[PDB]
A paper describes a structure:
One of these crucial enzymes is quinol:fumarate reductase (QFR), which is an integral membrane protein with three subunits: a flavoprotein (subunit A), an iron-sulphur protein (subunit B), and a membrane-embedded subunit (subunit C). QFR catalyzes the coupled reduction of fumarate to succinate with the oxidation of hydroquinone (quinol) to quinone on opposite sides of the inner cytoplasmic membrane. We have determined the crystal structure of QFR from [name] at 3.6 Å resolution by X-ray crystallography. All the redox cofactors and a bound menaquinone are revealed in our structure.
Two hetero-trimeric complexes, each comprising subunits A, B and C, form one stable homo-dimer (A2B2C2) with major contacts between two C subunits. The main driving force in the homo-dimer formation thus comes from interactions between the C subunits. The C8M methyl group of the flavin of FAD binds to the FAD-binding domain through a covalent bond with residue His-A43, which is conserved among these A subunits of QFRs. A fumarate molecule is also observed near the FAD in the A subunit. The high-potential heme bH is proximal to the hydrophilic A and B subunits, and has as axial ligands His-C79 and His-C166 on helices α3 and α6, respectively. The low-potential heme bL, which is located distal to the hydrophilic A and B subunits, is coordinated to His-C38 and His-C129 on helices α1 and α5, respectively. One n-dodecyl β-D-maltoside (DDM) molecule from the detergent used to solubilize and stabilize the protein is found in subunit C of [name] QFR. Instead, we have identified a new bound menaquinone near helix 1 and heme bL in the QFR structure of [name]. The Tyr-C63 that binds MK exhibits the lowest B-factor compared to the three other free Tyr63 residues of the asymmetric subunits C (i.e., G-chain, K-chain and O-chain), which might result from the formation of the hydrogen bond between the side-chain O–H of the C-chain Tyr-C63 and the bound MK. We propose that this bound menaquinone (MK) serves as a novel redox cofactor, or a coupling site to gate the proton-coupled electron transport across the membrane in [name] QFR.
Numbering used by the authors:
A (entry chain O), B (entry chain C): 1 to 212
C (entry chain B): 1 to 240
D (entry chain A): 1 to 622
E (entry chain M): 1 to 79
F (entry chain M): 393 to 471
The structure:
Amino acid sequence: MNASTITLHVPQRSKIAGRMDFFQMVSGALLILFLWAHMMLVSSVILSPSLMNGIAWFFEATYMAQIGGPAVFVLMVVHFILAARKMPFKQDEWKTFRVHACMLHHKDTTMWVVQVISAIFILVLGAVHMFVVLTDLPITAAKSAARLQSGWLYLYLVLLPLAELHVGVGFYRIGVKYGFVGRNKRKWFQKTENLMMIGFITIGLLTLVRFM
Amino acid sequence: MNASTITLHVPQRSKIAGRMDFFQMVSGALLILFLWAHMMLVSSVILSPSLMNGIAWFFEATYMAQIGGPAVFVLMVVHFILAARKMPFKQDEWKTFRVHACMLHHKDTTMWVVQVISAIFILVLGAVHMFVVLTDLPITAAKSAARLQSGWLYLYLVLLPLAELHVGVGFYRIGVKYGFVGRNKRKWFQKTENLMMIGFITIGLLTLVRFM
Amino acid sequence: MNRMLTLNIFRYNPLDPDSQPRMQTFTVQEYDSMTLFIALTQIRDEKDPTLKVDFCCRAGICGSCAMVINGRPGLACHTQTKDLPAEITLHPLPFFQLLGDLSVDTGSWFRKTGLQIEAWCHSDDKAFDPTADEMRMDNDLANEIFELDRCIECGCCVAACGTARMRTDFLGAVSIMRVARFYLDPRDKRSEDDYYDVIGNDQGVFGCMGLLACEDVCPKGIPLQDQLGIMRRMMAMHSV
Amino acid sequence: MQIYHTDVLCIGGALAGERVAVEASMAGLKTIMLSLVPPRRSHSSAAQGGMQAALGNAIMGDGDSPDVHFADTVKGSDWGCDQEVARIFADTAPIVMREVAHWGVPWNRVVPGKHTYYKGGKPFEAEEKAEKAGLIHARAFGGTAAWRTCYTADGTGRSVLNTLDTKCLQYGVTVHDRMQAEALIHDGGNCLGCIARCLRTGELVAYLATSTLIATGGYGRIYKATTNAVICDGGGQIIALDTGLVPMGNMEAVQFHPTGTVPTDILVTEGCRGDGGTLLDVNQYRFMPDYEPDKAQLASRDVVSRRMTEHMRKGLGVKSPYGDHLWLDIRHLGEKHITTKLREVYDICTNFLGVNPIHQLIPVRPTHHYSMGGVRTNRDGAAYGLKGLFSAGESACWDMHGFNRLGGNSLAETVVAGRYIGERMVEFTKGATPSFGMQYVEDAHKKVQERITDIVTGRKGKENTFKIRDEMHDIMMEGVGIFRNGTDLQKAVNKLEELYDRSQKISLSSACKGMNPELSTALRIRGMLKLAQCTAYGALDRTESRGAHTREDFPERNDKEWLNRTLSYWKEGASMPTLEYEEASPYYEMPPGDRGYGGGVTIANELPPEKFVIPEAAKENL
Amino acid sequence: MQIYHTDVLCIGGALAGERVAVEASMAGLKTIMLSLVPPRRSHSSAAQGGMQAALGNAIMGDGDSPDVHFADTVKGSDW
Amino acid sequence: GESACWDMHGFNRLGGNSLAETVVAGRYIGERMVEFTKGATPSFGMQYVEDAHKKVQERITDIVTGRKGKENTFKIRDE
Ligand SMILES: Cc1cc2nc3c(=O)[nH]c(=O)nc-3n(C[C@H](O)[C@H](O)[C@H](O)COP(=O)(O)OP(=O)(O)OC[C@H]3O[C@@H](n4cnc5c(N)ncnc54)[C@H](O)[C@@H]3O)c2cc1C
Ligand SMILES: Cc1cc2nc3c(=O)[nH]c(=O)nc-3n(C[C@H](O)[C@H](O)[C@H](O)COP(=O)(O)OP(=O)(O)OC[C@H]3O[C@@H](n4cnc5c(N)ncnc54)[C@H](O)[C@@H]3O)c2cc1C
Ligand code: HEM
Ligand code: HEM
Ligand code: HEM
Ligand code: HEM
Ligand SMILES: CCCCCCCCCCCCO[C@@H]1O[C@H](CO)[C@@H](O[C@H]2O[C@H](CO)[C@@H](O)[C@H](O)[C@H]2O)[C@H](O)[C@H]1O
Ligand SMILES: CCCCCCCCCCCCO[C@@H]1O[C@H](CO)[C@@H](O[C@H]2O[C@H](CO)[C@@H](O)[C@H](O)[C@H]2O)[C@H](O)[C@H]1O
Ligand SMILES: O=C(O)/C=C/C(=O)O
Ligand code: SF4
Ligand code: F3S
Ligand code: FES
């Protein structure tokens, strides 16, 4: 009936586009909120091993990871699906963006390309981390100090900059693209936000070495 | 110099598209040979856990999971990049390919959709499984337990179909399109490959229960 | 043969906006060996003359009859009401700019896509004189040349290609095979490198995902599967 | 409104139209090709048989020359043709076949060896030249002596038009498909273009150009049964007829092809009768040596078609709900053979009929095929009553054919003829240039032609377009067939005249829309009827039997008082075509003689022995 | 050669040219507007001052009429 | 417009009046153009568009390039 050309899905046009982008913004926003909570609650090794063990038992023995593990698992893959839409896979999309971004000297343009490299590194390394710690074994700080340092998990340095780099540019972009920023307020947002990120690399890198 | 457009690379033209397509096909063959290696070695628990353990401590100090494990991780994701070029992430590529795919009632056309859905499932669980067994702990028949009973790896009832379907339609496809085609040999190839796929899923599900 | 064929014909008319798409039901008595060409021409020339179908030869070698018949892009005139079920559904070809009802514009696409691929014999221009004798050609090469130049440019293998329907800049089994028909012709003096410049970058050859709907919908039976195949190798082997 | 310019406007995109556009464009003029459907699909594509040009390469053509070709051509045309036209054509056919072969057609070539052919319904062995291997192969066809017909498997039309079109794209011919010409843009007996109709929007367009060509092809859809594609109403004819300046030539000459398929009316090729065809009767008896003894089904066409309706009146046809018919036997020919493995008439019988040719017999009946008359031209192809109008093709009366067209000569006429007429068009355009007065394009033309559209749309004048169409079809099928008598002809012309009156008051069953597909046919009903009575009244007042025109009351050929061409003008506003007559080539190279088949009874020419051989100034040198 | 048709040919597409094309096209006539560069960028676009026309609105123009316009125009301009 | 001598500006152009003249003059001259066109219609003899036009003017181009009379156009512009 409409299995042909005409125009889109209903008797006038499709609304799928705005809904679809919007839900990329809310998968980015809700997922940003999770990573805040993760690097707050479980970033407690340096405060006390007892504190993280307890705050994990705070909600259903390691923060309800049977209802919260599949939450960030399936929702993080659904993010991957919504964003892979724009990812420069086509060898020409790469070729062009690399020349345009290297010729322009423009920063945020060039930050999109790192948003990309970061995204593939965290699908792989992240899916295997999130999974290895998501499989039962309710949390102990002493068992986590287990892996880290042996498992062998370690790394996360090859994850933490890529990860928070990504989340950072992601907050910055989501703010601009829908209008929560300047010109007027613009620089405050970028410098503020670059500080948010560099701070997250700090409390993460020391949550990391102190977990050891 | 040539930094805007007008034509390609070097002084005239760029061959990158063929090279990279050739490389999507070379990844397809190499990955197919591996997944044969896997469904030989690890399906040997039907025959005996001694044959699987023995041939498992055989290859280059147990298949060199130092030097060969990274082979299949980097190679499986490299495949992932080469294939994501064509994956219908855009909401209209999906919507259309679903409307056209239901109206044509044509087979191989619809199997492209399974290459896709299977593709995301074997991305995540393929990475996370390949990782939990890709690590240290040299291999035993006993280790599973990394499956089954007390084990919480229940997913090879999901991973096995998505994987062996994908490898099947992929083996079939790489045959046509590159000149191993029919139409003469097309059918002998067609039910050769159909037979091959349902046969590997059976002896896989029987390796799965005969691991219990 | 006396049984009652019921048709649901796509109906749309872009020139007056008030016309929305819909499904219109028709009623025809079937006689012996009746083509859908007969059915439709009587539906039009009898009941509603404003139905637009594109008919040329009713012998099946032109390609204006193209449409979707009960789900498959196919040929209306060259398809007979014996093989079809009791109810039929005729849809305009996809991918192509729909002009109205069952009619689409194809040849426009073929000419743009033709220049894209530059399908003609490129004459090195040795100052050939039709005063003098003609070209040397074995019978079997010129016969597969006939097999490929035989395409009727109907539009079925594109309207059945998921790739094309999904990516409009994809140029189609048609275009791949057409370049094939100039590759294997000697009279076309073109370097294999030129051929790559035409179909070797993506959107023609490596754009194909291998659905094989071309081969399976082609009405005149071009050897699309293995010609497409031998072309993706010949071009893909541009590599070192 | 929407005025376009060019130099060379080719009205029709098919095979001649394409060749001519390619020559204007080879010498570099700007060109518009109007086409009712994409140029690929025309009626030239449905051509299954082959392309006739004298070669000399095949063993069964050994020694053939354009002398033989001309000779055969004229004989087939019943000395109804211009022998200047046919000289030029016979010598220009090879130039054109080497040329088009060089454009990449997949001509079937020769294979050295000894092969087993078929001449009658019996095979004979014959060798094939050892030194002419890859040259261009031919086949037996029509009334030829040697085998000159050059072919690509089955569809030769597809395969020649197809490379002709690739040459079109290469040289950049702008093509507006879906343009239905309606009137011609003229005044002062000078032609400035035509007014046309967009087959998409529905509004008129008006191409303006110096040199204009009519490629529109045959008018056969005025008949119930015809091998013509449904796009053949004869547009350029009806637009050159409504001018009343340029006439229609030899209009009555309507050639019927014998092997027209019975159930669908589709044509099965004559390469079938050309390689061991077998025409059989209800009892399956090969009856051609009974009527035409030596040349049998390789006889002239109007001959075999006539003999068949004879043999069928006797009571010997096969009886079908489709009507009684005879059989064509190619099972004779072999299975893996079928004109190179596939044959594409194999698909005609396979999909449309219930017959497999390697087993059963093809129901076949004489049915309408080529249409000889058309827009009259000259030796250089400029149309008659109006300056700057050109024509080539089926729509044209060049009269290289006369009163019967020899099989396979129309392809060679399209490229041979498109090349020549084009050449003259090229240098005429590169000559003087007109003045486009808009009280021609605007006054009338857009006005009169927009006016007939309005009258056909809004008005009372109610008559259903399909009843005048189908009543016309019955009138032509019964009145003017193969076998014709005086009284059924006049009876027909009388009802056709009143039907023209009725066809001026037309109504549409429909509700108007932008581009209504009904109006396309309804506005051309009047035109269809008109050139149909040009054929009918041309045949009534021509009392003699020549070519496919066979009069039961005047069976002899009657060279004395008709050796000539029936030119039909119209002039307003009338209900009847005016009939004027004109000499068939005074050039006579081969004076009137016997064809060497058929039942020829001639009233021998008396006047001509004056002139006969006087080939004085030959600008036929080319 | 390479001939184009229209009803109204505007040689220049700038500000005068555009208005005239707009009323010919407002009455629905085929019109070609030729321009040495895209119509936006012309010299009419460089005009910074303003456009002089009778209003009746401004408080510094209250009572303003085309009489004064006609007068000042003629008189600053000599004849 | 400015290209035109309508002479609403005379020998001194009124400030702000040149914008007013292009749009006002477009309205008025335009209305008049729709009148003269919508009326009688001409005949484009190609011995005008083709002969001369293309002939004389492509002659100025060919004489400027391939020909003698060698002098630099810039020196003549600046002088
Ligand atoms: C089944 C069939 C088989 C044939 N087989 C042979 C054969 O084997 N050997 C042989 O020599 N001849 C054969 N012929 C004859 C052949 O059709 C003609 O002699 C010739 O090929 C037609 O070419 P043409 O260019 O004059 O016109 P056409 O090919 O008939 O087409 C006319 C062109 O003008 C266009 N046109 C149509 N109407 C209009 C209009 N109102 N206004 C403007 N443009 C219009 C058309 O779109 C078309 O493009 C066959 C014909 C048929 C029908
Ligand atoms: C700096 C400057 C400031 C001005 N400020 C004001 C102001 O503030 N208020 C005011 O009222 N007036 C002002 N004017 C005057 C103003 O420029 C004109 O009176 C008017 O605005 C020009 O508009 P126009 O469309 O008639 O012509 P133009 O703006 O001069 O445009 C010329 C058109 O003709 C096209 N054309 C050019 N050459 C050719 C060619 N060889 N062949 C074919 N087509 C061609 C052009 O490409 C262009 O489209 C100013 C002028 C200048 C230079
Ligand atoms: C497979 C996993 C992931 C992939 C493929 C991925 C990739 C991407 C891509 C390609 C975009 C760009 C959208 C655009 O350019 O318009 C994006 C945006 C974003 N990403 Fe990720 N990322 C992943 C994981 C994460 C994680 C772990 C976070 C952590 C909070 C995150 C947060 C964000 C945010 C906030 C945005 C901005 C949303 C918007 O622009 O509307 N992503 N991501
Ligand atoms: C249910 C979801 C999650 C849970 C229960 C969880 C919990 C944990 C636990 C127990 C550790 C072990 C600490 C150690 O290694 O000593 C850890 C470390 C880590 N995990 Fe997660 N996490 C979750 C989601 C994520 C996500 C979405 C990411 C994205 C990259 C991530 C990345 C990391 C990193 C980067 C570290 C160490 C670096 C640091 O602490 O600064 N985790 N997490
Ligand atoms: C993240 C991992 C993977 C993803 C996202 C993925 C997805 C895809 C997709 C969408 C295609 C279709 C390419 C096209 O239609 O042109 C493809 C091709 C193919 N896949 Fe994978 N797949 C993955 C891993 C695998 C695995 C585990 C196998 C197992 C043997 C495999 C074997 C093949 C083969 C042989 C082809 C055909 C290559 C070609 O068309 O040139 N892939 N893959
Ligand atoms: C070096 C790489 C790999 C090795 C040595 C390996 C080894 C194994 C082992 C020991 C098992 C049995 C128990 C368990 O799953 O814990 C297994 C099962 C399985 N693995 Fe892997 N694995 C590798 C990578 C992969 C890859 C690339 C895939 C691709 C999908 C895969 C998919 C599966 C599946 C589906 C099963 C169970 C299905 C069945 O037995 O039929 N593995 N593999
Ligand atoms: C969004 C997901 C992650 C992004 C993945 C996107 C896939 C595309 C990545 C590869 C694209 C490389 O883009 C460009 O390719 C060309 C051709 O191969 C390379 O070209 C280079 O290597 C080739 C191959 O030897 C040489 O012939 C050439 O002289 C040299 O310049 C460029 O160095 C590279 O910049
Ligand atoms: C391996 C790669 C995997 C591909 C990526 C993951 C799947 C593709 C992601 C985008 C899917 C788009 O989603 C598709 O269209 C819209 C969403 O706007 C959904 O919502 C609706 O769309 C149209 C309606 O006009 C219908 O075809 C569909 O039935 C309906 O659900 C569809 O259910 C879904 O088919
Ligand atoms: O039937 C054929 O082969 C063609 C006959 C003709 O038109 O000459
Ligand atoms: S391939 Fe088959 S379908 Fe596509 S055009 Fe050539 S013939 Fe028609
Ligand atoms: S259907 Fe499509 S992908 Fe190539 S295989 Fe045929 S064009
Ligand atoms: S109508 Fe001519 S091919 Fe279908």
